[PDB]
Design a binder for this molecule. Structure first.
Ligand SMILES: Nc1ncnc2c1ncn2[C@@H]1O[C@H](COP(=O)(O)OP(=O)(O)OP(=O)(O)O)[C@@H](O)[C@H]1O
Ligand SMILES: Nc1ncnc2c1ncn2[C@@H]1O[C@H](COP(=O)(O)OP(=O)(O)OP(=O)(O)O)[C@@H](O)[C@H]1O
Ligand SMILES: Nc1ncnc2c1ncn2[C@@H]1O[C@H](COP(=O)(O)OP(=O)(O)OP(=O)(O)O)[C@@H](O)[C@H]1O
Ligand SMILES: [Mg+2]
Ligand SMILES: [Mg+2]
Ligand SMILES: [Mg+2]
Ligand SMILES: [W+6]
Ligand SMILES: [W+6]
Ligand SMILES: [W+6]
Ligand SMILES: [W+6]
Ligand SMILES: [W+6]
Ligand SMILES: [W+6]
Ligand SMILES: [W+6]
Ligand SMILES: [W+6]
Ligand SMILES: [W+6]
Ligand SMILES: [W+6]
Ligand SMILES: [W+6]
Ligand SMILES: [W+6]
Ligand SMILES: [W+6]
Ligand SMILES: [W+6]
Ligand SMILES: [W+6]
Ligand SMILES: [W+6]
Ligand SMILES: [W+6]
Ligand SMILES: [W+6]
Ligand SMILES: [W+6]
Ligand SMILES: [W+6]
Ligand SMILES: [W+6]
Ligand SMILES: [W+6]
Ligand SMILES: [W+6]
Ligand SMILES: [W+6]
Ligand SMILES: [W+6]
Ligand SMILES: [W+6]
Ligand SMILES: [W+6]
Ligand SMILES: [W+6]
Ligand SMILES: [W+6]
Ligand SMILES: [W+6]
Ligand SMILES: [W+6]
Ligand SMILES: [W+6]
Ligand SMILES: [W+6]
Ligand SMILES: [W+6]
Ligand SMILES: [W+6]
Ligand SMILES: [W+6]
Ligand SMILES: [W+6]
Ligand SMILES: [W+6]
Ligand SMILES: [W+6]
Ligand SMILES: [W+6]
Ligand SMILES: [W+6]
Ligand SMILES: [W+6]
Ligand SMILES: [W+6]
Ligand SMILES: [W+6]
Ligand SMILES: [W+6]
Ligand SMILES: [W+6]
Ligand SMILES: [W+6]
Ligand SMILES: [W+6]
Ligand SMILES: [W+6]
Ligand SMILES: [W+6]
Ligand SMILES: [W+6]
Ligand SMILES: [W+6]
Ligand SMILES: [W+6]
Ligand SMILES: [W+6]
Ligand SMILES: [W+6]
Ligand SMILES: [W+6]
Ligand SMILES: [W+6]
Ligand SMILES: [W+6]
Ligand SMILES: [W+6]
Ligand SMILES: [W+6]
Ligand SMILES: [W+6]
Ligand SMILES: [W+6]
Ligand SMILES: [W+6]
Ligand SMILES: [W+6]
Lengths: 246, 268, 268, 246, 246, 268
């Protein structure tokens, strides 16, 4: 479709939910062991989300009246911290955390040096976050997708603390009526109201995407799901972005 | 809608939850720099034209900062168009073009800053903001590069690889984020017309219009292009902008004095 | 103890040589910012409490900088405790936790800075110092993040992986290094008590005490924890500190005016 | 001649003219394909020039009266942009753009990580550019040579949009009388007046050079010339620097 | 002992005394040749001390009355300069100097890219140096140990211009009565008064160490000692830190 | 020689084309900081001598900035000579030595800055320039490190590996680039002599001389060495420099007041 070239067609991008990291060692150690075993199989950019500490900083910032552009970098910092924690656990395998400018400009050389690098999933919108909601809309799912698609990566897998997307929050008030969605499209999700385990802005950037045709959301609390998802096995919710092949 | 209810929702729901979103919308609204005006000095429309356009505006800025706190952002212009042409021709995506354009807006800010240095006015880069210069009567202004920082994470347009959020958007978002009182875009036409005034010897001048009206009139005069107009409709703090001709002696000075030169574009 | 004898020792001995150490101790003592007061705004104790605690202190800072040069450092608080819990649970060492906590103190400084920006007061990061803002009557204050820069080279505590030198230590060391006249820690209790006043309905207030007395009384009320208290005993310039309750309207203003609010802790 | 040691004796430095980049895809795509094929053969520092956009920024800056030290970093930025464009095209081969401090201090580790890196050919003279001309004299040819010689590189090849040096500008008013120079010396060039396809300052730094004995200028618009030049084949103009072997 | 994990258990840390570097080529060239031969055998972080130029900056700073926090970064800069010199000598082997933030966060990827990197041994305490002495206490031995132990490195070897620790300064007034100590403990050293060839603060950080059980001080002016020490051979003074195995 | 002819040449010729060079030479000449004086405080000649030399000059700078805008650059000195000796002995090239010397000039600037901080005068590093401090009456001065930024791209001298452009050149080029009104080098001799006054008990003092005359007299007194003297002959803005003895109480103050202390060296 005359689309832009893929910059890193061999790259697999993996976004790790900040609420997975927030579970601490019980979740992180099995995830690290699974990532270790994946290093020889894939060339990975592992991007971390923010999780509960961003909620706390939002609670303070909103109480101080701060605008959405003030809150964005404050949440981004939490995703960075999670990336530093994860990279520390993988340091002995040669993995380090890299900052945004390095991800933006020097990822190819870093993935030549080593099999995986970790970075923040939040995009550097910061004080130029868009207005409208008091909650920064371009968060970790959105940033990871923007990067994956800009690079023309072989995939983006979103690793969450739930099996995938349900028809309602499976940890919420309406938990009883939450039905699992094995497959959905971004456009179908965009026209539903209600919470999701992914940013709403992710659906918007899926609409303008040029390369990534599907993103799978999988439960990183179940060993082996991330491995399976990276081989294309259907083990969580597939989201079709509406990109079609050339 | 207390702190407590908001904090509970923040802890227990996804940020996408409509209930949390609604509770956050009820938060207090602090304006960080409410007494500043953000001005964008056009790249193609002003700086690329050299001394004849830039020197009078430098004099205006110097005069104006006596009465008005200014955040002065720069456009990119012809060199960015050149970069975008080369990169688009190679099949590079919008995120790559976005970094290229940032460099050109930075060159323009450096040039403008060098003309303003002896007047005490700095070029700033992290916090465009810059709290110290903005607070001094001797200073009361700063220059910054207008491109947003999105780089590789730039949202693409629906079609094509030209970054949609460029220096008008970058300056607008700074005004919006800092809660500034006024946003003035300084370009090379008197304002908005019913047609592009360079390619039509018939366009009618529009002193005031809303974004909805521009869309409904099917306006294509992209003195301000749509991405920044959509941002304007979503804005919390800056709900109208003014477009003025920087090539007219004193137009900036007059707009800062509350004169209705140019075109006022309102969110609603 | 001339320049010459000192220079000879410096050339010819190890820096560990007791003779060189003694000669260096006789050097002149320049105070870099002798007229500044360093204040620490508590993370858990103040900033984490939001508007009710922070807004009055912002008003105090704005009022106070009219008469007093201030270096305002921030604490870290609950988010750092969360990070430390996750990282300690993974077996990460103190040097890794130290970097995590720095980020939280930086978030707090960014928030406080945004409330102070319209008053001209910047957030600074390299030279906390910042010579220009500190010297202007219109400014006369700066905000900085309180964590020391030790990162991976953080000295561990004797037990456990929680970094021992956190934001009280970072602010104290800045006051000490710059030779500031006063160090005020702004937290959420009136000062030091004979017991922790949150977990004891019986603690007795202590207006003034030395570090030796705190140790001898076997004080566990860690409104200031021991690592900063040991630094205080070694300090050249700042030989006492004041702990005040930032939640009480005007307490900071009064401490800056020389009123003996809170607890004065002396080195000896 | 008691000369300084060579820091990276195995390095090949390739300067790509900004006017080659300015030709866009038609020139850049064949050049990228040739560079791709060179990666397994050589350890390359690829440095880009500035081209026409620097002319535009000079036109504006000079119209604003700005001094030569103001114009230098403004032209350097254009060379950086070209380096970012080129590196993007080679990202899938592991190549990234590296900034000046990295080139100055960390090139050895970067060339250990990957086979080539791209950087700006302009030197970081910036506001400390020398006075005399209103046009910054230390430009891309000069910076690339300074680096190549400081490193004691195995070579510097200058890739231009012309076959090499002629006796007059072969695209100029006197184009008719322009004769091709297969070989010349820096000192012979320095004592001629008239335009060249290389900076005049390059001749001056050739005079104080310690290692590089010859620099070849070749037409990067002809596939295979850069490959041949990197093997020492004579396919453009050889410039003898006047360095002699130890 | 429930101790923190080792981040880079395979790393060997080597601290090179600034007074070794101050001997110039006569000391540095044999040391570089020995390091070259070690690159295929070990994964090395080579950290340099400051030496005599830090003494000079202390003499000036103390004469100006500057506090210990002012003197700390001024001495650190000298250690950085020595690291840049050493890395230049090893550039052709792929070794570069890396700055503190890179050592702190990105060492694993750098040691994936290349076999050794050089950095400063001084820790980034700078204006937050501890008060008490007018001489910065956390110097190069101390910084190198902090890093080695934080990483859980396989070792730290301190390369000095003397055989190891003596009972008095073997280059001092009491040189006549200086007896060589083949082995000692940090606690025994901490309770002696008198000069040492290592920072006193090193003994303090040894007391709180979690991993490094012994540090050997060896004479880098004798070829082959550093090689032997890195294989655990006893060729200088072993310092027992008081860490015991888990 | 219009904009148009210049723009045509800029588009269509090599920058090496004598016609384009001539057209560019006819451009307007803007001075960025025309009212500033650049002063270099000697490394070996002043700062390395410690308090006896530096304290009086700090007092002079503080007094002087009341009437004069100052950009104060530092020399490098003995530690750089040490680094250059070690590195030259290893066969390192001038580009490597250049980075080493920068570090020493930076240490000196940090020391001088710490003595000036309480007076509001900052150390600056990017834009030496620094527009805000330079414009304030309370400030009106900044300190910067004198080494040029050439690093690995340093031009070598004709012989040897010692970088030819060091801190005299760096300060001179800043004065020249910013179009400053005056350049004063502050060293440890009264000025230029017909011989080196340290190694000759007979040298004659020269109050004023041109660079051509220094070359023709075959002057080897390298109080200022030739690379900066050649730069001076090419300069657009600063066409003479003054060398003064910073060790004489008030000499800097007097030179800033227009007194002809020391030696004036002219381009022609
Ligand atoms: N429709 C839904 N389907 C599945 N989960 C949902 C849905 N709506 C809300 N959720 C909630 O989303 C939670 C995931 O929370 P969230 O997505 O904020 O965390 P995260 O992705 O780990 O954080 P971050 O975005 O910072 O990385 C799930 O645990 C679930 O409770
Ligand atoms: N004597 C000459 N021989 C060959 N080319 C010449 C000569 N004199 C002028 N030129 C012109 O030099 C042009 C190359 O332009 P120039 O060297 O500025 O571009 P570049 O090297 O690509 O740019 P940059 O220096 O920014 O990398 C040739 O196309 C030719 O027209
Ligand atoms: N008890 C001792 N045993 C051995 N050497 C000693 C002792 N006391 C003092 N020294 C001196 O310590 C010297 C080493 O000096 P020092 O340790 O400062 O240098 P360095 O380690 O090379 O410098 P840096 O700490 O900057 O790397 C030896 O040459 C010796 O003269
Ligand atoms: Mg999620
Ligand atoms: Mg050329
Ligand atoms: Mg030692
Ligand atoms: W981040
Ligand atoms: W981060
Ligand atoms: W980051
Ligand atoms: W970053
Ligand atoms: W960031
Ligand atoms: W920001
Ligand atoms: W921003
Ligand atoms: W930029
Ligand atoms: W600039
Ligand atoms: W700039
Ligand atoms: W700034
Ligand atoms: W700055
Ligand atoms: W910013
Ligand atoms: W910004
Ligand atoms: W900002
Ligand atoms: W910022
Ligand atoms: W900003
Ligand atoms: W700033
Ligand atoms: W500022
Ligand atoms: W500023
Ligand atoms: W910009
Ligand atoms: W920080
Ligand atoms: W911020
Ligand atoms: W900030
Ligand atoms: W600052
Ligand atoms: W700044
Ligand atoms: W600092
Ligand atoms: W600091
Ligand atoms: W500082
Ligand atoms: W600093
Ligand atoms: W500091
Ligand atoms: W600053
Ligand atoms: W400042
Ligand atoms: W400032
Ligand atoms: W500032
Ligand atoms: W901090
Ligand atoms: W550049
Ligand atoms: W660049
Ligand atoms: W660059
Ligand atoms: W750079
Ligand atoms: W640059
Ligand atoms: W510059
Ligand atoms: W510069
Ligand atoms: W350092
Ligand atoms: W350094
Ligand atoms: W460093
Ligand atoms: W550093
Ligand atoms: W450093
Ligand atoms: W510092
Ligand atoms: W510091
Ligand atoms: W420097
Ligand atoms: W410093
Ligand atoms: W400094
Ligand atoms: W600054
Ligand atoms: W700054
Ligand atoms: W600069
Ligand atoms: W500079
Ligand atoms: W500058
Ligand atoms: W600059
Ligand atoms: W400068
Ligand atoms: W600045
Ligand atoms: W400034
Ligand atoms: W400043
Ligand atoms: W410098």
């Amino acid at each position: 479709g005359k689309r832009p070239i893929r910059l890193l067609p061999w790259l697999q991008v993996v976004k790790i939910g900040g609420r997975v990291m927030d579970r601490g060692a019980d979740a992180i150690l099995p995830l690290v062991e699974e990532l270790r075993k994946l290093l020889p199989e894939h060339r990975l950019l592992i991007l971390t989300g923010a999780g509960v500490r961003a909620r706390h900083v939002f609670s303070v910032g909103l109480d101080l009246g701060l605008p959405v552009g003030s809150l964005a970098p404050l949440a981004a910092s939490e995703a960075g911290q999670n990336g530093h924690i994860l990279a520390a656990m993988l340091a002995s395998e040669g993995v380090s955390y890299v900052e945004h400018p390095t991800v933006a400009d020097q990822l190819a050389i870093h993935l030549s040096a080593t099999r995986a690098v970790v970075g923040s999933a939040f995009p550097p919108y910061h004080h130029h976050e868009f207005p409208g909601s008091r909650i920064p809309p371009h968060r970790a799912d959105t940033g990871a997708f923007l990067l994956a698609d800009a690079f023309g990566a072989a995939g983006l897998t979103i690793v969450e603390n739930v099996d995938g997307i349900y028809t309602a929050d499976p940890n919420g008030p309406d938990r009883g009526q939450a039905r699992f969605l094995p497959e959905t499209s971004a456009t179908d999700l965009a026209k539903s109201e209600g919470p999701l385990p992914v940013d709403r802005a992710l659906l918007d950037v899926m609409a303008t995407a040029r390369h990534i045709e599907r993103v799978q959301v999988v439960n990183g609390l179940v060993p082996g799901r991330l491995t399976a998802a990276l081989r294309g096995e259907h083990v969580g919710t597939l989201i079709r972005t509406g990109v079609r092949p050339a | 809608n207390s702190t407590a209810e908001l904090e509970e929702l923040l802890m227990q729901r996804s940020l996408t939850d409509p209930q949390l979103q609604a509770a956050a919308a009820a938060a207090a609204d602090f304006r960080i720099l409410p007494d500043a005006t953000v001005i964008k000095i056009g790249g193609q429309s002003v700086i690329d034209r050299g001394r004849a356009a830039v020197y009078p505006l430098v004099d205006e800025i110097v005069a104006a900062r006596k009465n008005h706190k200014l955040l002065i952002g720069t456009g990119a212009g012809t060199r960015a168009r050149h970069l975008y042409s080369i990169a688009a021709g190679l099949g590079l995506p919008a995120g790559v073009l976005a970094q290229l354009g940032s460099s050109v807006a930075d060159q323009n800010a450096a040039m403008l800053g060098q003309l303003l240095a002896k007047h005490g006015i700095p070029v700033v880069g992290g916090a465009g903001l810059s709290a110290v210069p903005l607070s001094l009567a001797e200073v009361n202004a700063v220059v910054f590069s207008g491109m947003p920082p999105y780089k590789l994470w730039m949202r693409p347009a629906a079609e094509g690889v030209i970054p949609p959020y460029r220096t008008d958007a970058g300056c607008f978002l700074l005004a919006e984020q800092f809660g500034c009182k006024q946003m003035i875009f300084v370009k090379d036409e008197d304002g908005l017309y019913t047609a592009n005034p360079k390619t039509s010897k018939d366009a009618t001048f529009i002193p005031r219009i809303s974004v909805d009206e521009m869309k409904a009139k099917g306006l294509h005069d992209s003195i301000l292009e749509f991405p920044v107009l959509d941002l304007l409709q979503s804005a919390q703090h800056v709900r109208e902008v003014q477009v003025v001709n920087g090539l007219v002696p004193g137009n900036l000075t007059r707009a800062l004095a509350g004169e209705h030169v140019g075109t006022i574009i309102t969110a609603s």
